[PDB]
């Protein structure tokens, strides 16, 4: 309910702190570093800029890309995908360190990952974005929202919805401390289709929602009702993913020579 110091409170805070540390350990680029790069606050880095086909080549030569001949849209698609199978592995490692999670029935852990992965992906993508573009290649390129919209018929409508969300999301001015708990909340969602044993899911979750409420009270005097704007964000996301999956249907049946990565096909499998 209320505004007295909870006798659970230090746990909550110990929990917040536990997750904040695993978060930085599983997520090599945080929001702090990412805002730094887009602030020209740190100098070491300055990302190369990709604003047109001309600078595409230029940068595709000054950045060591771990995919990469085939056509541009595809090359870019290929790389969103690789970063994507990478974020799966990083999300799995982090999940595994939320207290309670590894003693869940493994059948169910698989379900909770399958449905949360893309939701998380989308919120981590917001950290890397302004209304102009996305940091790519572990902060080594800046790719332009407009250049992305410039690609051919299927392909240049795949990032827009994620930019659409990022602008709305970033307006909550959340930080890595808020995000590490959000993410464990998302993952731990008892509404998932196919969960065999949900009670212990719901339990861990209440606790994370407590942790989150508390965190947002301490960290954010500025907004009276952020906790709820965030609860609302969790819903928008499932609708954004549905759109993502549906689109990806088109592409699958518009491009021979495709092959989606086997990990990604798995998640995509029987998904809503």
């Amino acid at each position: 309910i209320e505004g007295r110091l909870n006798p659970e409170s230090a746990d909550l805070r110990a929990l917040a702190k536990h997750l904040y540390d695993s978060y930085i350990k599983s997520f090599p680029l945080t929001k702090a570093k990412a805002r730094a790069i887009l602030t020209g606050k740190t100098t070491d880095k300055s990302p190369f800029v990709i604003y047109d086909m001309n600078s595409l080549m230029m940068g595709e030569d000054k950045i060591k890309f771990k995919h990469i001949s085939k056509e541009v849209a595809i090359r870019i698609f290929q790389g969103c995908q690789f970063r994507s199978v990478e974020a799966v592995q990083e999300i799995t490692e982090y999940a595994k360190s939320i207290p309670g999670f590894v003693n869940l029935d493994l059948n169910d852990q698989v379900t909770l990952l399958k449905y949360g992965v893309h939701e998380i992906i989308y919120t981590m993508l917001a950290s890397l974005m302004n209304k102009d573009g996305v940091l790519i290649s572990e902060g080594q390129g800046f790719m332009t929202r407009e250049f992305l919209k410039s690609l051919r018929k299927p392909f240049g409508d795949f990032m827009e919805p994620k930019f659409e969300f990022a602008v709305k999301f970033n307006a909550l001015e959340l930080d890595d401390s808020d995000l590490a708990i959000f993410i464990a909340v998302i993952i731990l969602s008892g509404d998932r289709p196919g969960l065999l044993n949900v009670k212990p899911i719901e339990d861990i979750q209440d606790n994370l929602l407590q942790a989150l409420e508390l965190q947002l009270k301490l960290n954010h005097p500025e907004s009276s009702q952020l906790f709820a704007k965030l609860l609302q964000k969790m819903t928008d996301l499932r609708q954004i993913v549905t759109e993502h999956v549906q689109l990806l249907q088109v592409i699958k049946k518009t491009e021979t020579d495709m092959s989606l990565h086997p990990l990604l096909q798995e998640i995509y499998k029987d998904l809503y």
Partner: peptide, 10 residues
């Protein structure tokens, strides 16, 4: 089955 996600959870 989801073989890969399974294998990831070790």
């Amino acid at each position: 089955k989801h073989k890969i996600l399974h294998r990831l959870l070790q």
